[PDB]
Amino acid sequence: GPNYSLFSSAAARWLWSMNMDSVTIVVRVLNVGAGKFNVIVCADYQMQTYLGIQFETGISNNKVHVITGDGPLNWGYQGDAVNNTTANGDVYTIKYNDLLDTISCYKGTSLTPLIEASGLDVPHGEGFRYTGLAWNTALLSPGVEPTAWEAKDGV
Amino acid sequence: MLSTGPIMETLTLTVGSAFEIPGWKLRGEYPAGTTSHLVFTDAAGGTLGEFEGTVSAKEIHYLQAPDDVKNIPHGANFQLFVTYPSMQPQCLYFGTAIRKEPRYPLSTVVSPEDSAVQYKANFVGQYIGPMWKPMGNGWGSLGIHTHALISEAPSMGPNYSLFSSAAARWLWSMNMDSVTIVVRVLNVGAGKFNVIVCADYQMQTYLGIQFETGISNNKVHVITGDGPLNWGYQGDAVNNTTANGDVYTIKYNDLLDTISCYKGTSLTPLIEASGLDVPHGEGFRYTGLAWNTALLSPGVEPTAWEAKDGV
Amino acid sequence: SSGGGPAVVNNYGDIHTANYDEFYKGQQRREAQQQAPILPVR
Amino acid sequence: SSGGGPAVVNNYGDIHTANYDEFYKGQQRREAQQQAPILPVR
Amino acid sequence: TDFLKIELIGRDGSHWVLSGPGMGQQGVTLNPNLQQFYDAPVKTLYVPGPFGEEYAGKRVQRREIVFSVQAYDEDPDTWSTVDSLWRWAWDYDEESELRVSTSDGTRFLKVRLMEEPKPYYEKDPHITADNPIVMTVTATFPYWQDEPEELIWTTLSTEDMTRFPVRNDGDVPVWLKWTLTAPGLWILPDFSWGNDMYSRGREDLGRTVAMPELVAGEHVSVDSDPRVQTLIAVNGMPTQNRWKGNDLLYPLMPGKGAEIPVQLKNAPEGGACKLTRPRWYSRPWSRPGV
Amino acid sequence: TDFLKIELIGRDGSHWVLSGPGMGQQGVTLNPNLQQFYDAPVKTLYVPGPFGEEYAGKRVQRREIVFSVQAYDEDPDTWSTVDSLWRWAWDYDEESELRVSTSDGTRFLKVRLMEEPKPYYEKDPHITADNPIVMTVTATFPYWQDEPEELIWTTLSTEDMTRFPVRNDGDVPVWLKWTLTAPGLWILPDFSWGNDMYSRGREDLGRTVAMPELVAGEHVSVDSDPRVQTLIAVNGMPTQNRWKGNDLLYPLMPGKGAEIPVQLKNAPEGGACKLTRPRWYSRPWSRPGV
């Protein structure tokens, strides 16, 4: 997560890039507080424009959103928000499918999409195959953060 | 050397540094209206860059942002043209751009270990093939059965001329702990068919999904390995009647430590198990199949088999 | 350097140091390998 | 003086002057001595 | 000089300019007196005859190049880095590229370490930080080569034919490579080009050989060079087992060229073929030969 | 120079500084022109081929270092003491260390007297009390070595498993050694690391070999080095007879490493596994490569 000794919101990018447009991101997370954790797909080398799945944990905002990035730390929302509670050791699978131009998130073992979106306006192809993570918290304590991350090219 | 010609020169590029050609290097006499342009192309001739120089009374100066040149690879060939007014362009220098910078080979290259794999088998050729290694009963324990009586494709199973049980290990290993298996299977009699994942080299320990069919024993178990031909039931069984041409997806998710089986296109696991005491990691990514029948005839056998990294 | 000295003597082959004893013994060993299994036990 | 010239060529052994025909004839003579008394008279 | 540039692309992908424009930028320059670098070593054969000896043929030999480089830097630590990088740029098992660029283009030779390099002077190299490395590299393939000329012909018809323009502008005969899709029965040219090596120079002027009928998914590569097996399927099927001892026998002789015909039959989908013509030369630079 | 330091640790434990800081304090300095000291001598094999000769592999050769030292002192008696000590530092049967320290660390070479030393000038040595000794030493193991890395895993459980982190930072493959306690059944990794010398480079990526069941007191040393037998029981029992033809075949290839899995089963009193990974280099100094 962020180093809360001197920071509150922090973004990270994977050093390498995916070789194909479709991608799968499997993340095992922890909910040790309140905050926002974004799994970032189809980003550029600066994470300026990207798709993402955001997990918000809070008193009234225990939800998941589909986000489109405007810079690494600033983003906007697309579509509604699906209610979701995240427990310690929860595994989420964020799949971007290029053929359907869709971004979906599944929870645990079920294959039904926990959240879905399609037709979002972001560039793709070469130079937009970077994945990453982002954390945004109002407080200076960890919120929802990943203990395990894995990426696979294609769906 | 009667005609004017270019001079073979070289260019230097650095990541994060502004590309710049000083004016005193491109000296000479240039009247007003003279224009200089630098063109970068690749091995096929496709233009990958073009820049305009700042021609002055006696010097030509080039200065571009690092983002303009970051796409120019080492070995890309450049061509610098000067153009006096009311004249055709005249090439002054040509050559190659070398990159004088720290070199990152690991960024560009992808190791075989860092590559998702996808394997497929159909047994339509009526031969086992070199990709399946027999296990448990040794060499020649596998076979292909046509099922020509019904409108069905050939399926792999034990060599029923010699054995009633057998195992097969897919020759190569996966690169991820999480793995997806898709099997289209046929139920032509009583027997047990195991789909085996997270197996070691000799298939001594593994996770697996067992499809058992019989007169009144049509169910699905989660099994752990005790050898290529022995297994231990984990959890409770789930009733499941297998029909000919049924497609089952066995997904092992590493981060969830969960092996699940879905029937057909169902979005809910037909069976599911978690937290099994089986080693995982490098050396524990082989996959395979196993068959065990009481009689010397095919039971549940896979017509089509497919495997892929990740879930 | 190499062309015109010991490195071309090596190309010449067995002009300098090379003995007859081990060559004859090796030829005899090869012939013995060829003919020993087919020689009768009598 | 001796080390590094013909006096060490002698240690090298049969690198310079040494003939093949005489060596082959000597080996044949040794084999003939070994095998002649045991060959039959027929 | 600006008329000649010599570069080395190491087995690790490093790029060095030993001679020419921009030489020594990476710290390593090329010392004079490099041998077996220009002409491909060839030994000729002779049989006894009434008038002395009669010509029996020629064989091209592998290149045994011996050359010295000079690794230099202002400070010994950076010199040590440069020397280590130069050593890393070489290997015995795998070959690094050695490119020569002139007005005739760029031709590359694949070279590997024939033996251990001989570095430094009599004293320790940190005194000078400017030391020579003598290197004995070898070229298993002794010909300088350029990027091969490739042509592609695709079709949708069940039966079709095409003409490929081919021309050897180099010094030495080159061996053609084919990539053929499946299914389909191909007939490929094996023209002698007047070559009398089998005493069939004009008997095989228009020789065409039929490949075995390829089954679905069995796309083949047919490389005529003797280093490699001729027919190799991409699905692992034993294609040459079905070829009854047939083979491609003739290289494209220097100075020869024509519109060689390729025939495709029994192709329900309609397949594609690709012809690769290598550009081999016996010299780093040479004017084109008609 | 301060960038390079050369020492000798004799068979009797004597410490000599031949070059670098503190050189000549023990009376012996190193003379220039030392051969076969830097690069490991490797010979390459070539076999006849269509275009000359084809590469057939490489064989490393034992090192033959011919170097001169100078034993000096102000008075002939103490000079004679120094010369005698230097001679006593060497032997034919037992090896002594030749250590090179640079900014890349310290790497040693086990060298022994190949032949008798050639000492002194043509006149009486006591005249000058400053005389050169010509040493022809040999390295049976031609690779410069660093101290091997040792890892210990002790478990009290009947069945357990561990991950040993292993990584080859050198330019040559290395062979691992295991020390396994008894009783118990061990499963050890024999990963190919992509090495394809048994035509199973991909099939044996995650290969594991199961050692025979060990009875009480049958502690084993399992060394992959070809120079030594793989399984050696400490008490002398033949334990390779219960091994059914299985063996450890693969070394740790350069630039490769992972967390190799070691499994212990059926251990009534737990078990201890020690992994020794050698650190071999072909040069006295070199920058890390990957």
Side-chain angles (χ1 to χ4, degrees):
Chain A
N3 48 357
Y4 285 116
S5 47
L6 73 165
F7 277 123
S8 67
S9 54
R13 196 207 81 195
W14 193 240
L15 186 61
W16 300 269
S17 166
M18 305 296 133
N19 294 349
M20 303 197 282
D21 267 336
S22 294
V23 70
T24 310
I25 305 299
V26 188
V27 181
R28 173 186 182 275
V29 295
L30 293 186
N31 200 2
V32 296
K36 309 161 151 203
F37 172 53
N38 310 351
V39 176
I40 305 305
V41 163
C42 286
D44 70 286
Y45 76 108
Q46 294 181 13
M47 282 179 66
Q48 292 284 327
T49 64
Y50 54 79
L51 301 175
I53 298 283
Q54 164 156 333
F55 313 89
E56 295 186 357
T57 63
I59 294 304
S60 175
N61 270 344
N62 273 322
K63 288 190 168 298
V64 292
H65 301 76
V66 169
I67 67 161
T68 300
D70 301 332
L73 304 171
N74 185 6
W75 54 78
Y77 294 119
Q78 273 76 23
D80 76 320
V82 181
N83 222 315
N84 180 20
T85 179
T86 299
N88 293 315
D90 263 9
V91 178
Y92 295 95
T93 302
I94 294 94
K95 301 182 186 171
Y96 172 77
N97 200 324
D98 192 21
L99 281 73
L100 313 180
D101 197 6
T102 186
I103 176 67
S104 164
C105 178
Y106 315 81
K107 183 175 192 307
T109 306
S110 73
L111 288 169
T112 181
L114 163 69
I115 200 167
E116 208 163 8
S118 302
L120 304 169
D121 194 359
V122 291
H124 295 298
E126 304 284 326
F128 307 96
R129 299 204 177 106
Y130 289 90
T131 58
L133 311 169
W135 305 264
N136 200 2
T137 53
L139 276 73
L140 277 296
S141 167
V144 57
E145 288 181 358
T147 50
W149 173 93
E150 79 184 18
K152 178 187 51 63
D153 189 359
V155 303
Chain B
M1 209 52 196
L2 290 176
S3 54
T4 68
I7 303 165
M8 201 204 291
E9 205 66 31
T10 177
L11 271 173
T12 302
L13 299 162
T14 317
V15 294
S17 181
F19 158 79
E20 162 194 357
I21 305 186
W24 61 271
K25 295 191 157 179
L26 285 169
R27 266 189 326 260
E29 271 304 318
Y30 308 104
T34 306
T35 49
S36 175
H37 57 111
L38 183 45
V39 190
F40 291 83
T41 72
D42 52 5
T47 288
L48 59 86
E50 188 176 1
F51 314 109
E52 271 275 325
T54 313
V55 190
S56 84
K58 289 191 286 182
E59 309 195 314
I60 308 175
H61 179 72
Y62 281 83
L63 183 45
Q64 302 289 327
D67 304 331
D68 296 348
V69 292
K70 68 163 292 199
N71 47 353
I72 307 170
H74 68 279
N77 46 11
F78 76 95
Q79 217 164 356
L80 192 146
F81 296 89
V82 71
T83 312
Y84 297 96
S86 69
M87 264 179 250
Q88 299 293 273
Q90 166 203 359
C91 176
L92 280 189
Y93 298 94
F94 79 103
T96 298
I98 62 174
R99 289 201 153 276
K100 199 176 174 187
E101 67 194 8
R103 207 173 58 84
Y104 309 128
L106 300 196
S107 73
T108 66
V109 65
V110 159
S111 48
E113 55 89 19
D114 197 83
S115 71
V117 286
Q118 191 175 1
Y119 304 128
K120 194 176 283 187
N122 54 1
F123 322 123
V124 74
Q126 280 96 11
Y127 66 94
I128 283 299
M131 286 310 299
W132 293 103
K133 190 208 252 192
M135 291 269 186
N137 291 345
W139 293 0
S141 50
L142 306 166
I144 309 282
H145 322 95
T146 313
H147 320 289
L149 211 52
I150 45 178
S151 182
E152 278 305 321
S155 78
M156 184 170 65
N159 194 4
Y160 287 119
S161 315
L162 316 173
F163 320 92
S164 52
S165 66
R169 206 274 307 271
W170 182 256
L171 203 70
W172 299 331
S173 168
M174 313 279 151
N175 295 103
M176 302 188 82
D177 291 337
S178 49
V179 61
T180 303
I181 302 298
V182 181
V183 298
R184 177 187 180 287
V185 299
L186 267 52
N187 169 53
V188 305
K192 295 187 269 234
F193 169 59
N194 311 309
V195 171
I196 282 152
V197 302
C198 287
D200 58 304
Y201 190 81
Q202 309 280 350
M203 259 169 71
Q204 295 292 133
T205 75
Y206 47 80
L207 294 178
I209 299 300
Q210 171 152 73
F211 318 99
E212 164 152 41
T213 63
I215 191 65
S216 188
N217 265 276
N218 313 310
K219 51 206 190 300
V220 164
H221 313 264
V222 170
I223 66 170
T224 42
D226 202 6
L229 299 178
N230 296 334
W231 48 82
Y233 292 119
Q234 320 282 138
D236 286 328
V238 175
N239 301 344
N240 181 57
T241 304
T242 303
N244 296 17
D246 273 6
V247 176
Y248 293 86
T249 305
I250 298 100
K251 271 148 61 59
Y252 175 76
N253 186 203
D254 176 60
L255 301 194
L256 196 59
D257 206 359
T258 292
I259 172 171
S260 56
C261 180
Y262 318 83
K263 178 177 189 170
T265 177
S266 65
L267 310 183
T268 289
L270 157 69
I271 209 177
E272 179 176 350
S274 176
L276 277 298
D277 185 24
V278 167
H280 299 294
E282 310 99 299
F284 304 110
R285 299 168 172 162
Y286 293 93
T287 191
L289 313 162
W291 307 260
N292 195 10
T293 58
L295 299 101
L296 277 296
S297 76
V300 179
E301 291 194 356
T303 296
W305 177 88
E306 199 258 334
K308 69 187 64 57
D309 271 4
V311 287
Chain C
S1 61
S2 289
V8 76
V9 160
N10 300 317
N11 302 120
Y12 274 95
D14 65 38
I15 63 170
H16 280 171
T17 77
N19 63 6
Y20 312 151
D21 190 71
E22 74 93 19
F23 187 88
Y24 194 84
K25 286 190 295 185
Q27 290 306 139
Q28 290 326 98
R29 270 175 293 166
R30 281 190 265 176
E31 302 266 339
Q33 173 166 0
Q34 185 68 32
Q35 293 139 46
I38 68 184
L39 271 178
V41 72
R42 148 186 277 152
Chain D
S1 56
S2 292
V8 76
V9 164
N10 301 317
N11 303 122
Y12 275 101
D14 65 32
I15 70 155
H16 278 185
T17 297
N19 46 8
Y20 305 165
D21 194 64
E22 273 75 12
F23 179 87
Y24 191 82
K25 279 195 279 149
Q27 287 310 130
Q28 289 326 284
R29 254 176 293 122
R30 172 77 250 181
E31 294 290 328
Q33 172 169 9
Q34 178 72 27
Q35 289 139 47
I38 72 183
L39 274 179
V41 67
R42 150 185 284 154
Chain E
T1 48
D2 59 356
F3 306 93
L4 168 64
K5 189 173 176 180
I6 305 192
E7 311 105 356
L8 178 85
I9 297 89
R11 63 146 187 94
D12 53 1
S14 63
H15 194 277
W16 312 75
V17 180
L18 310 176
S19 166
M23 66 160 201
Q25 290 303 103
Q26 304 88 22
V28 175
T29 66
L30 189 67
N31 296 339
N33 190 9
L34 77 175
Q35 55 187 56
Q36 287 203 9
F37 184 78
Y38 307 104
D39 282 328
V42 170
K43 82 170 167 80
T44 56
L45 316 165
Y46 307 98
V47 310
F51 297 100
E53 275 181 308
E54 300 291 326
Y55 187 67
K58 73 175 171 305
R59 302 289 180 269
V60 61
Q61 309 296 140
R62 77 173 166 93
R63 280 186 206 250
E64 296 143 11
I65 316 184
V66 184
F67 67 99
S68 193
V69 293
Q70 190 94 2
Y72 158 77
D73 210 289
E74 285 294 324
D75 49 344
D77 275 315
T78 317
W79 168 89
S80 194
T81 313
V82 169
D83 186 76
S84 304
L85 292 184
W86 178 255
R87 180 55 198 91
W88 276 112
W90 290 95
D91 198 30
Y92 310 94
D93 283 310
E94 57 188 358
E95 283 165 329
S96 61
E97 192 161 299
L98 186 77
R99 294 171 77 79
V100 160
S101 181
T102 47
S103 82
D104 303 278
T106 311
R107 297 172 204 188
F108 61 91
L109 205 64
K110 304 303 292 295
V111 287
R112 49 158 52 85
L113 283 180
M114 194 198 314
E115 64 187 5
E116 65 279 354
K118 188 175 173 67
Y120 318 138
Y121 286 126
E122 58 179 5
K123 304 171 144 99
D124 64 334
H126 291 97
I127 282 178
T128 316
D130 187 320
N131 297 279
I133 311 164
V134 180
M135 304 188 72
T136 309
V137 311
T138 186
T140 300
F141 185 72
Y143 295 130
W144 294 80
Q145 39 181 346
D146 218 328
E147 301 288 335
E149 170 174 354
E150 287 170 345
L151 304 156
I152 289 176
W153 168 74
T154 183
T155 187
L156 307 163
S157 304
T158 296
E159 179 161 356
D160 213 358
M161 203 200 90
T162 192
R163 288 304 172 118
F164 277 111
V166 68
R167 173 73 63 184
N168 198 335
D169 207 4
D171 305 330
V172 293
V174 302
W175 300 85
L176 302 192
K177 195 184 168 62
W178 303 88
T179 311
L180 311 171
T181 53
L185 193 148
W186 296 86
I187 295 98
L188 296 190
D190 201 35
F191 292 171
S192 77
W193 309 107
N195 199 353
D196 215 10
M197 72 160 87
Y198 302 122
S199 304
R200 302 181 50 104
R202 52 186 316 196
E203 186 176 356
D204 287 350
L205 270 179
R207 173 167 192 254
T208 46
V209 54
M211 308 301 142
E213 173 91 34
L214 310 183
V215 306
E218 198 202 327
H219 320 292
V220 299
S221 66
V222 192
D223 199 343
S224 52
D225 64 351
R227 291 210 298 290
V228 180
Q229 188 180 344
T230 310
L231 260 174
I232 280 297
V234 305
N235 67 338
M237 263 163 190
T239 309
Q240 204 164 305
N241 286 105
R242 293 183 271 126
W243 200 26
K244 294 181 177 67
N246 281 278
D247 201 357
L248 302 162
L249 318 174
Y250 292 103
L252 174 76
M253 284 311 274
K256 299 293 176 66
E259 296 291 329
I260 50 176
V262 183
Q263 303 170 75
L264 170 57
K265 313 198 207 322
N266 304 69
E269 285 94 0
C273 76
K274 168 184 211 179
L275 170 66
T276 300
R277 171 186 81 74
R279 297 209 264 255
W280 298 348
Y281 310 91
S282 75
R283 199 170 260 206
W285 58 86
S286 70
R287 296 290 183 250
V290 57
Chain F
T1 62
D2 53 354
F3 312 97
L4 163 60
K5 182 177 189 107
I6 305 184
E7 310 105 353
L8 183 83
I9 315 296
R11 65 179 176 88
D12 52 345
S14 48
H15 199 133
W16 308 79
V17 178
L18 315 176
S19 164
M23 63 169 274
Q25 295 306 306
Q26 303 88 21
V28 177
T29 80
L30 180 66
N31 290 332
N33 195 21
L34 74 172
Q35 89 183 10
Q36 288 206 14
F37 186 81
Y38 307 100
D39 272 318
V42 170
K43 94 181 301 202
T44 43
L45 324 177
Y46 304 104
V47 73
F51 297 98
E53 279 182 309
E54 309 282 303
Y55 181 69
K58 58 182 267 286
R59 303 272 181 285
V60 71
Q61 315 281 109
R62 67 173 172 87
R63 274 181 199 253
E64 303 181 358
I65 318 167
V66 174
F67 69 101
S68 188
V69 291
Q70 193 93 14
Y72 158 81
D73 194 355
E74 286 87 4
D75 48 347
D77 290 308
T78 301
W79 163 86
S80 194
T81 309
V82 170
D83 173 53
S84 182
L85 290 186
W86 173 256
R87 181 56 191 82
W88 273 109
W90 292 95
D91 200 34
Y92 306 94
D93 278 316
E94 49 199 355
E95 280 165 328
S96 59
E97 278 192 357
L98 190 58
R99 317 185 72 192
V100 163
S101 182
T102 59
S103 64
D104 289 289
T106 311
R107 302 176 195 184
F108 62 88
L109 197 58
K110 303 305 293 287
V111 285
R112 59 158 52 85
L113 274 182
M114 201 200 311
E115 49 205 273
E116 70 283 347
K118 275 80 186 167
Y120 312 118
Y121 294 121
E122 70 269 10
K123 279 213 188 82
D124 183 31
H126 302 92
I127 290 164
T128 44
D130 184 9
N131 294 288
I133 304 167
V134 184
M135 313 284 296
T136 312
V137 307
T138 195
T140 292
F141 196 75
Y143 295 122
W144 290 80
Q145 293 180 355
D146 219 326
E147 289 278 332
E149 305 289 339
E150 306 175 357
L151 294 184
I152 306 292
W153 173 63
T154 314
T155 187
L156 277 296
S157 301
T158 299
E159 305 193 359
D160 213 346
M161 176 198 164
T162 198
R163 285 304 172 114
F164 276 108
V166 69
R167 173 76 64 187
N168 194 328
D169 68 313
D171 46 352
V172 289
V174 307
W175 299 91
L176 311 174
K177 192 186 172 66
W178 307 90
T179 303
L180 312 180
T181 55
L185 198 148
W186 296 88
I187 297 89
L188 293 178
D190 195 30
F191 292 179
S192 63
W193 310 105
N195 186 275
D196 207 359
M197 73 197 191
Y198 286 106
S199 72
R200 293 197 307 275
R202 200 172 172 189
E203 299 85 322
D204 293 358
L205 269 184
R207 171 182 209 246
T208 55
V209 65
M211 329 303 306
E213 174 77 32
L214 306 176
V215 302
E218 197 192 316
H219 313 85
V220 292
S221 73
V222 181
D223 197 345
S224 290
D225 216 1
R227 330 212 287 279
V228 298
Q229 174 179 359
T230 313
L231 280 172
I232 297 293
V234 75
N235 62 349
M237 270 195 286
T239 190
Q240 201 148 359
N241 299 348
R242 297 173 291 139
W243 204 21
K244 292 170 316 292
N246 214 355
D247 202 296
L248 286 160
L249 319 167
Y250 297 99
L252 186 68
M253 292 313 289
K256 301 292 188 72
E259 315 282 324
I260 50 182
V262 170
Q263 284 163 288
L264 168 67
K265 302 175 183 181
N266 295 320
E269 301 89 7
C273 170
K274 171 169 197 171
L275 158 73
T276 299
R277 164 179 81 77
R279 207 150 72 250
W280 297 343
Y281 308 94
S282 60
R283 267 175 159 217
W285 64 86
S286 75
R287 301 280 179 234
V290 76

